[PDB]
Amino acid sequence: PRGSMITQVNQLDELQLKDLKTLRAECKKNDGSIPNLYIHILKQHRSLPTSFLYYQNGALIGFLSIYFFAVEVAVLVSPQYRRQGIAKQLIKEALPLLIFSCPSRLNDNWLTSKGFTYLHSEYFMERDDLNPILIRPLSFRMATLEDIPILCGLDEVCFPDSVHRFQQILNEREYEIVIAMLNNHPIGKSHIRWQTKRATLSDIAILPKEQGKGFGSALIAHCINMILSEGKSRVDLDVETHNKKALNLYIQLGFHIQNACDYWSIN
Ligand SMILES: CC(C)(COP(=O)(O)OP(=O)(O)OC[C@H]1O[C@@H](n2cnc3c(N)ncnc32)[C@H](O)[C@@H]1OP(=O)(O)O)[C@@H](O)C(=O)NCCC(=O)NCCS
Ligand SMILES: CC(C)(COP(=O)(O)OP(=O)(O)OC[C@H]1O[C@@H](n2cnc3c(N)ncnc32)[C@H](O)[C@@H]1OP(=O)(O)O)[C@@H](O)C(=O)NCCC(=O)NCCS
Ligand SMILES: O=C(N[C@H](CO)[C@H](O)c1ccc([N+](=O)[O-])cc1)C(Cl)Cl
């Protein structure tokens, strides 16, 4: 009680950042997944004091932060000190001034009972198998700037400023987009962000009318193989869903869940 301290901090200096990662690892090991913390964000000054740090005897045991992108609340309490009022004190420090990101399966029963509402879930998946995948009537090509109409059309029906977003992606050298063609019709796309040791698939879209035919799996399998041919040892994948049933697609291709969050809401 004497040794318990809450500091409201407009931006995390270096040392505060290193303590958070200690707390994150600890929560990661105990819960399996962690909330979104947005580390690169936590370093910038903002207009109101945003991150809330709970210390016990100088040791960080709780953290709550608010993000301005609606508002996203991330809350993290050391397993040793849970159910002792810590999160409750932490939101009050942010109540006079809500989308919670939540480790999948941890808090499902009691979030409903209080009147939270489930939005959707996000998954970071990883495929570490170095063996390729080993046949649909699809061809593939890399998108260019002259594919902007196609790319905007696909994004319109699969994720209801697209022109300039795709202009920005296509002009960034770490990014490429693969287009899937059914005969002479583009029916899908996948974005690749390349790094030295790995590459990340995102924004995978198949036209609604062409779904259920294996084109999605063929597209991702093509991107996996393309990544392995370049000597990467890992394919990552970010996908947002409303239902867990949707992940079997990626489980079949060798992806494993590395992190999983459910976005819940309240006011
Ligand atoms: C979710 C989390 C932040 C709660 O921290 P906490 O300090 O243990 O929660 P508090 O003690 O402040 O509040 C407890 C109350 O909120 C609910 N609550 C919190 N944890 C609960 C749990 N395991 N089971 C049921 N209700 C819970 C209850 O209403 C509880 O009532 P109580 O007063 O009788 O204890 C903590 O469990 C954690 O860090 N989990 C990993 C990250 C996470 O799930 N973030 C989502 C944030 S909502
Ligand atoms: C999500 C999406 C990309 C999937 O595309 P899709 O072409 O319908 O996916 P597929 O047809 O390849 O696979 C669907 C199911 O058939 C299975 N499948 C594919 N090939 C199979 C095969 N040879 N044998 C058995 N099952 C197969 C898959 O396992 C999958 O699940 P199931 O086992 O329960 O049946 C598509 O729905 C879409 O574009 N949605 C809008 C955007 C979106 O949701 N993006 C999320 C990724 S960022
Ligand atoms: O949440 C999203 N994206 C990122 C991953 O690209 C995710 O939220 C994230 C947040 C914080 C973080 N961190 O704290 O280092 C990592 C990933 C949206 Cl695509 Cl829903």
Side-chain angles (χ1 to χ4, degrees):
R2 171 183 170 150
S4 91
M5 193 191 67
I6 303 175
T7 55
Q8 333 186 349
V9 158
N10 262 80
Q11 67 261 20
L12 261 56
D13 70 69
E14 179 64 44
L15 191 40
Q16 298 170 313
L17 187 84
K18 192 185 291 181
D19 285 347
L20 176 60
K21 296 177 160 76
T22 305
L23 182 59
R24 172 186 85 190
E26 202 203 338
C27 291
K28 181 64 167 194
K29 134 263 140 183
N30 183 78
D31 309 331
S33 295
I34 52 144
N36 302 315
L37 292 165
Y38 299 110
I39 296 301
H40 55 275
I41 291 182
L42 290 185
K43 188 46 166 117
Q44 34 159 300
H45 183 291
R46 305 181 231 169
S47 78
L48 273 160
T50 184
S51 298
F52 296 83
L53 283 65
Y54 198 110
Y55 293 97
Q56 184 65 30
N57 304 315
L60 186 81
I61 58 160
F63 185 84
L64 185 152
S65 200
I66 291 176
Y67 300 96
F68 296 106
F69 288 111
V71 270
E72 210 197 319
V73 184
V75 197
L76 255 205
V77 176
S78 187
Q80 302 163 23
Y81 299 91
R82 284 170 190 187
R83 299 314 283 291
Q84 308 205 12
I86 306 291
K88 201 177 310 178
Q89 304 183 251
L90 280 173
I91 307 157
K92 307 210 161 110
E93 301 298 306
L95 265 180
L97 91 170
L98 293 321
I99 296 175
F100 292 77
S101 58
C102 304
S104 176
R105 312 191 72 113
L106 193 62
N107 306 312
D108 303 0
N109 38 307
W110 70 264
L111 286 174
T112 58
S113 71
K114 317 313 269 201
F116 284 80
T117 297
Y118 170 84
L119 272 52
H120 61 301
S121 304
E122 186 177 14
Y123 301 85
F124 308 150
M125 312 205 67
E126 305 189 324
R127 187 183 181 283
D128 292 291
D129 182 351
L130 289 176
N131 290 305
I133 286 165
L134 285 76
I135 191 90
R136 304 314 294 143
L138 294 179
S139 64
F140 308 94
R141 56 189 187 76
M142 313 304 304
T144 64
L145 286 169
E146 308 182 283
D147 289 311
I148 287 285
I150 290 167
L151 298 171
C152 290
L154 287 170
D155 211 273
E156 199 172 324
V157 306
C158 297
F159 309 90
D161 197 333
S162 295
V163 156
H164 284 122
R165 185 173 146 273
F166 283 117
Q167 221 269 359
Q168 294 135 25
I169 295 164
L170 284 172
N171 287 334
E172 288 303 307
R173 62 176 71 163
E174 68 181 333
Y175 281 97
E176 291 178 300
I177 303 183
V178 173
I179 293 167
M181 310 282 304
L182 168 58
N183 292 308
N184 313 308
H185 292 83
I187 66 89
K189 107 264 214 272
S190 171
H191 304 189
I192 304 182
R193 179 175 52 94
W194 297 94
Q195 301 177 259
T196 306
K197 304 197 72 28
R198 66 179 214 197
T200 312
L201 307 187
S202 77
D203 310 296
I204 300 150
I206 299 285
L207 280 184
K209 300 286 138 139
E210 304 304 345
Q211 307 194 12
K213 305 191 197 167
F215 298 155
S217 305
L219 168 55
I220 293 152
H222 183 84
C223 291
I224 297 177
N225 300 336
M226 174 189 314
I227 294 161
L228 290 169
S229 73
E230 294 280 354
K232 321 295 152 159
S233 38
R234 184 162 133 242
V235 191
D236 306 328
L237 179 137
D238 309 313
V239 53
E240 298 184 58
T241 73
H242 298 251
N243 60 110
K244 305 172 169 51
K245 192 154 180 214
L247 299 176
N248 304 340
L249 174 55
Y250 316 102
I251 304 304
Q252 298 204 150
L253 295 145
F255 282 86
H256 313 105
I257 308 175
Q258 184 273 316
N259 196 83
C261 275
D262 301 322
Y263 295 91
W264 291 86
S265 104
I266 227 194
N267 250 318

